[PDB]
Amino acid sequence: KASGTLREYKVVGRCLPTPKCRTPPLYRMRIFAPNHVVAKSRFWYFVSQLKKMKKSSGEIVYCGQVFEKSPLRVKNFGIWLRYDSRSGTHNMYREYRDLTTAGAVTQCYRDMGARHRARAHSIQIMKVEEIAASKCRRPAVKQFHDSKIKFPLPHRVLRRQHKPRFTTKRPNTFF
Amino acid sequence: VFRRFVEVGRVAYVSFGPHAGKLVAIVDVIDQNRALVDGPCTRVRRQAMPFKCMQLTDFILKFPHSARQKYVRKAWEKADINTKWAATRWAKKIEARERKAKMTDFDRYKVMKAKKMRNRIIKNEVKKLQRAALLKAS
Amino acid sequence: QVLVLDGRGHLLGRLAAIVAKQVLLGRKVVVVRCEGINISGNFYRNKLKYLAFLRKRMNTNPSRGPYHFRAPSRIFWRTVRGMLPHKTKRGQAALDRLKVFDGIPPPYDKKKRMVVPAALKVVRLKPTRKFAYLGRLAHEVGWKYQAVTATLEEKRKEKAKIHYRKKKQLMRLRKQAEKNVEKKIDRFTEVLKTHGFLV
Amino acid sequence: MKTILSNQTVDIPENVDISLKGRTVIVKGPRGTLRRDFNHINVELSLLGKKKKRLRVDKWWGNRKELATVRTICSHVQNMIKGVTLGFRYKMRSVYAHFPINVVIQENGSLVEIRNFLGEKYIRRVRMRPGVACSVSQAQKDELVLEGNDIELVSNSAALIQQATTVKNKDIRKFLDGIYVSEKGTVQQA
RNA sequence: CCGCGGCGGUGCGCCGCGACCGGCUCCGGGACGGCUGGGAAGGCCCGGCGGGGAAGGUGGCUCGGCCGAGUGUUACAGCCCC
RNA sequence: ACCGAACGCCGGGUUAAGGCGCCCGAUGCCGACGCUCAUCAGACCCCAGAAAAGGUGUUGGUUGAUAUAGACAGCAGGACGGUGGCCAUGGAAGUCGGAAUCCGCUAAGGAGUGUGUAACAACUCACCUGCCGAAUCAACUAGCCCUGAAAAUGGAUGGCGCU
RNA sequence: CGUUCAUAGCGACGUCGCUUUUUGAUCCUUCGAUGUCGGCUCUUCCUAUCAUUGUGAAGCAGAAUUCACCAAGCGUUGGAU
RNA sequence: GGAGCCUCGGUUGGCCUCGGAUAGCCGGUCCCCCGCGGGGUCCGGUGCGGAGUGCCCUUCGUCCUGGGAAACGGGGCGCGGCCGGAGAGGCGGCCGCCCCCUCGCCCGUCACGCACGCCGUUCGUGGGGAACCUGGCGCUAAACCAUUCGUAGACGACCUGCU
Ligand SMILES: [Mg+2]
Ligand SMILES: [Mg+2]
Ligand SMILES: [Mg+2]
Ligand SMILES: [Mg+2]
Ligand SMILES: [Mg+2]
Ligand SMILES: [Mg+2]
């Protein structure tokens, strides 16, 4: 796995039928990935671990992108992880605040790279669950839960440093 | 010593982006560095938008932090923000700057001719004022 | 046809980078008030870093070996020299365009002088970060003429304050003049704000 | 992480009048002025209330080491106010097992000669920081009094005479001598 | 010899254009399909049904001129949200 | 000798592996999100350099607590008796050591954390209040940074530099 | 161990390192030759600091001291075999 | 003032506050203090900066005549006096007198090789350097050798002496 910005995918698949097992059970997952191609691969990786079931032994039935049903709501997402350290493998519960699951998992993948130099292929996302104002354990999230939120944008450092590469005016950063 | 604030209901002028040169109300703050934003009257769809691109006006129209777009449309049209914005000195010197860009070659020539004269008149009147100021000093 | 850049408030290498490319494209540049250049990283940090550079000498005959210039102008010149192909003819030609000064002397003390905002400290550094004035640095590594350069610049700032006061005085009269005249420049002043100035 | 906002208040008393040119508090009252600059602390020194009753210090989007300054600015203004009103009085008692550290102030407070420390021929001359004024007290035998408005300057000048009187190349557990700060009080209590 | 008529090869030297084809790299327009026969949205509003933040509210306190502003509590809907 | 790619002589196009402050072709993107300041910073296969073990440096986790029966620290009040308990006498009545190791009063104090004593004494280390006024605290874990970290001509993230 | 006290100074059983002023491994370079030990003489560097400056430690009362830090500026000699 | 080799780059100017950045810019002070200014308070304006380098200044065909608005401005490398400028000043400013002109903005009114579609045009330029013809006012050599000396010396060099 690598990235870009992910998309939730639904992928349901089954170990393909036999004489002995005529109508085998379907297994569904939530597989975040940049595209269906790697989605299906990612589906197979997770299933292999859990169930005696390989890409040869099975058929993916329905892979399909899943759309955030409330895009223009701001939400808080709890996300449970399973990363690999340099040392042992771990569990976490991260929390992000975003407009989407995909966005919230994407956000996670960047954080984990930042905070733990953890690369995609090490991380397992288990559950991603949207959450209330309460049931938010992280204070970095909790500070934005407030009705009359109010802050300034204090030392507003400029970009467009090469529109006028040279100029008479020393700039301004108070607004 | 701050005067403008990322408040809910603050109107912000978008400096750049897809929606560059458009007003936009801050519906809700998502993050350290991202605001859920709307500009119903100003042709800007409800979307998250980073602060880096928005620079914020002196207009806080009052609605509740996650109303459903209809209500901000009312609070915009009640306050008549489009009228008030175009009245501002800021928006005038935006309008100016655009009209300087639109300038055609004949229009550029007219201007030069108009300035050539208009700066001559003033220049003399300044010189007269200096002589009068020198006469007062004497 | 010539850049004059007030090196105050800039960052040593950050400015030097930009100056090099200007200089390589045939732009004649002047860099003024070089003592005011300021280098990221806390003072002590940079002193050691210089003091190390001092240690570098050709053991058998120091007289040959890397000439450690003290003056902030020459320091800044040294760092710009490090970003040109200065062993070439074209590189040597490039430096000959660049003209550096501790403080701001008589041709350029009555010239408006630019500021590279992409090399500027207020922009490029976090406000909680520490930095050093290349003056102080120069002073402690052996620069002789800090105080002289200060005493000459107090004159200049006093001399300039006067010029500005007279400039202001004209601007003010000019603002008055327009108001005195604004019925016999009215259908000029109108046309200069249809095509979008004066607003 | 970046805390969306922090602040504090510094309730100035009705005797004192504080004023802030930007981020450069100047506090004046009974005893005198005390300016202090905080260009280097990065905060919003608002000043609010009719009768100018309280000094507020916001600090937006602070991380842990940036939010550590908020209180230390607030506190420095508190001391500044105390200095203006009451004024600081550090008292320091001389200690010896033999050679009775002979102290004598000179110009006004400025100088402090400290003769016969440990039977040394060297006479320590110690200047005071501008503002602070040493004076040899009465009602207590071996004891100095440093008074002044700017606490920083006082306590520094106290240290100056404390480290002056130091013992070299001896067992300092055995040799307990010198002029040590005994008490950090005020010129007037109210 | 004048025709620079018709055809053929050419130009002393330096130039430019034009249209045709090949191979590229860009730009601007438009018209369609499929999906959770897309998801969200908008607009009109009506009838209900609850839950939450937290309110034209009330209340302790504070700050300004009964009104405006800032915290705090129980929480219906006369701000909204689900 | 690595990675990319294998050469007739040339024009246009496009790539690879690598890059794009300046040297040096290309980010002079209004690039996105974090992390990190180092008086030895760090900066890219082969490769030209460090470990065990530490650090309330800062940032994340994990697990457990705690507390309105208003805590947590911060100061103030007591720390006993059954009892020279038993083994050990060389002295251990809590205290070089070790088997023990409970009851009373209890508000509550271990047959005792230490200081110190030949041995005591004396001192010191729960349970509870008084004040103050919301979170507090422990143990792990892993990121960057730091200690650990000493070589001889002056010196090398390639250089200049860079926060 | 240090009367007592793991850590002032030490430090077993274990363990992790650096160094190339020891000696080995090794044989890449030089066999149409790179003059093979020591001493003298002279310069320069390193620090893993004996002394000297400034300091923290002690089982530092003083004196004498070992332990450590900044640190290589300046020194570090005359002889008998 | 005339020719005449050569070396090239250029192809409007900008004649300036200080500085700040969790702030600044301008006014005006009714009022107060200092040396027309400087400092203060108070109030009024600006502040994604229009007293803006996203800027300003300047115009880019020539002439003619015959109206209007604007109108004493410009010139003669016009001429004399009084300044300011030393950091590498190298540039300005301000004052007398002589002669000449009517230039910016609109309109009328004609004409200028109109070189017959086609390239280095257009300036800084009286440029930098070398060699050559005119006027006015100025000038009137040192150096080195040789010789000498000995504060010096391998030799050069150096210190000295010589109507
Ligand atoms: Mg001693
Ligand atoms: Mg023992
Ligand atoms: Mg060998
Ligand atoms: Mg040899
Ligand atoms: Mg050492
Ligand atoms: Mg030309």
**Secondary structure of chain A in the HEC alphabet?**
CCCCCCECEEEEEEECCCCCCCCCCCEEEECCECCHHHHHHHHHHHHHHHCCCCCCCEEEEEEEECCCCCCCCCEEEEEECCCECCCCECCCEEEEEECCHHHHHHHHHHHHHHHHCCCHHHCCCCCEEEECCCCCCCHHHHCCCCCCCEECCCCCCCCCCCCCCCECCCCCCCC
Distance CA(B22)–CA(A151), nearest Å, equals 22
The answer to whether A24 and A15 are in contact (CB under 8 A) is yes
Distance CA(D84)–CA(D29), nearest Å, equals 5
The CB-side HSE value for C72 (13 A sphere, CA atoms) comes to: 29
The position carrying tokens 């519960």 is A93
Tokens read off for A14: 């089954």
Distance CA(C43)–CA(A156), nearest Å, equals 26
Distance CA(D131)–CA(D153), nearest Å, equals 8
The CB-side HSE value for B82 (13 A sphere, CA atoms) comes to: 10
Neighbours of chain D (3+ CB pairs under 8 A): A, B, C
Looking at the complex, does the CB of residue C3 fall below 8 Å from at least one CB of chain A? yes
Write a three-state SS string for C108-151.
Answer: HHHCCCEECCCCEHHHHCCCCCCEEEHHHHHHHHCCCCHHHHHH
Q: Would you tell me the crossing angle of helices C89-97 and C12-24 to the nearest 10 degrees?
A: 110
User: How many Å does it take to go from CA A7 to C1' E66?
Assistant: 58
Q: Would you call A149 and B4 a contact, using CB atoms and an 8 Å cutoff? A: no
| CA D103 / ligand 1 centre spacing (Å) | 27
Q: Which amino acid is at C35?
A: E
- CA-CA-CA-CA torsion sign (A111, A116, A119, A120): negative
Q: Would you call A171 and C123 a contact, using CB atoms and an 8 Å cutoff? A: yes
Distance CA(D151)–CA(D87), nearest Å, equals 8
Q: Which amino acid is at A45?
A: Y
Q: Would you call B65 and A99 a contact, using CB atoms and an 8 Å cutoff? A: no
Among chain C residues, CA nearest to A166: C116
Looking at the complex, does the CB of residue D71 fall below 8 Å from at least one CB of chain B? no
Please work out, in degrees rounded to the nearest 5, the angle formed at the alpha carbon of residue A96 by the alpha carbons of A94 and A98: 155
The answer to whether D1 and B31 are in contact (CB under 8 A) is no
Nearest 5°: phi and psi at C131?
-155, 175
Give the DSSP H/E element, type plus range, for residue B109: helix B105-137
Tokens read off for B71: 């209500």
The answer to whether D131 and D150 are in contact (CB under 8 A) is yes
Q: Which residues contact B94 (CB under 8 A, 6 or more apart)?
A: B21
- The CA-to-CA distance between both ends of chain C, in Å, stands at 31
Instruction: Give chain D's radius of gyration (CA, Å).
Output: 20
Instruction: Give chain A's radius of gyration (CA, Å).
Output: 22
Q: Which amino acid is at C193?
A: K
User: How many Å does it take to go from CA D87 to C1' E54?
Assistant: 50
| CA C59 / ligand 3 centre spacing (Å) | 29
The CB-side HSE value for D114 (13 A sphere, CA atoms) comes to: 26
Q: Would you call B30 and A148 a contact, using CB atoms and an 8 Å cutoff? A: no
Q: DSSP code of C5?
A: E
Q: Would you call C127 and D66 a contact, using CB atoms and an 8 Å cutoff? A: no
Task: Identify the CA nearest to A148 among candidates B52, B12, B10.
Answer: B10
Cα D78 from chain centroid (whole Å): 12
Write a three-state SS string for B12-50.
Answer: EEECCCCCCCCEEEEEEEEECCEEEEEECCCCEEEEEEE
Distance CA(B71)–CA(B53), nearest Å, equals 25
Q: DSSP code of B95?
A: H
Give the CA-trace dihedral at C26, C27, C28, C31, to 10 degrees: -130
User: Exposed, middle or buried, B54 (CB in 10 Å: 0-12/13-18/19+)?
Assistant: buried
Tokens read off for B66: 């996650």
Q: Which amino acid is at D172?
A: I
Contacts of C175 in chain B (CB under 8 A): none
Strand F close residues, chain A 34-63, CB < 7 angstroms: none
Instruction: Give chain B's radius of gyration (CA, Å).
Output: 22
Give the DSSP H/E element, type plus range, for residue C2: strand C2-6
Distance CA(C91)–CA(C105), nearest Å, equals 26
The position carrying tokens 């003091």 is C51
Farthest CA pair distance, chain D: 62
Q: Which amino acid is at D53?
A: K
Contacts of B133 in chain C (CB under 8 A): 173
Contacts of A149 in chain D (CB under 8 A): 4
The answer to whether D105 and D94 are in contact (CB under 8 A) is no
Please state, as a whole number, how many other Cβ atoms lie within 10 Å of the Cβ of residue D23: 18
Experimental method: cryo-EM
The CB-side HSE value for C126 (13 A sphere, CA atoms) comes to: 7
Write a three-state SS string for chain D.
Answer: CCEEEECCEEECCCCCEEEECCCEEEEECCCCEEEEECCCCCCEEEEECCCCCEEEEEEEEECHHHHHHHHHHHHHHHHHHHHHHCCEEEEEEEECCCCCCEEEECCCCCCEEEECHHHCCCCEEECCCCCCEEEECCCCCCEEEEEECCHHHHHHHHHHHHHHCCCCCCCCCCCCCEEEEEEEEECCCC
Please state, as a whole number, how many other Cβ atoms lie within 10 Å of the Cβ of residue C196: 19
Tokens read off for A57: 């032994």
User: How many Å does it take to go from CA D167 to C1' H47?
Assistant: 62
Neighbours of chain B (3+ CB pairs under 8 A): A, C, D
| CA C52 / ligand 5 centre spacing (Å) | 19
Instruction: Give chain C's radius of gyration (CA, Å).
Output: 22
Task: Identify the CA nearest to D73 among candidates D91, D57, D85, D54.
Answer: D57
Tokens read off for A115: 């905070």
Helix (H, G, I), strand (E, B) or coil at C38: strand
Distance CA(C5)–CA(C123), nearest Å, equals 17
The position carrying tokens 């458009």 is B22
Q: Would you call C118 and A167 a contact, using CB atoms and an 8 Å cutoff? A: no
The answer to whether B11 and B82 are in contact (CB under 8 A) is no
Q: DSSP code of B51?
A: G
Phi-psi region of C103 (alpha: psi -120 to 50; beta: other; left: phi over 0): left
Cα C178 from chain centroid (whole Å): 37
- Collect contacts of A38-47 with beta carbons under 8 A, ≥24 apart: A38/A1, A39/A9, A39/A11, A39/A63, A40/A11, A42/A1, A43/A9, A43/A11, A43/A13, A44/A13, A46/A124, A47/A13
| Near-strand G residues (CB closer than 7 A) | C 59; D 168-175
Q: DSSP code of C184?
A: S
Closest ligand, as measured to the CA of D170? 1
Distance CA(C45)–CA(C37), nearest Å, equals 16
User: How many Å does it take to go from CA A172 to C1' H25?
Assistant: 12
Task: Identify the CA nearest to D180 among candidates D148, D143, D154.
Answer: D143
Q: Would you call D44 and B1 a contact, using CB atoms and an 8 Å cutoff? A: yes
Resolution, Å (one decimal): 3.5
The answer to whether D114 and D165 are in contact (CB under 8 A) is yes
Distance CA(D55)–CA(D46), nearest Å, equals 6
Distance CA(C24)–CA(C13), nearest Å, equals 16
Task: Identify the CA nearest to C124 among candidates A162, B15, B41, A26.
Answer: A162
User: How many Å does it take to go from CA C109 to C1' H75?
Assistant: 33
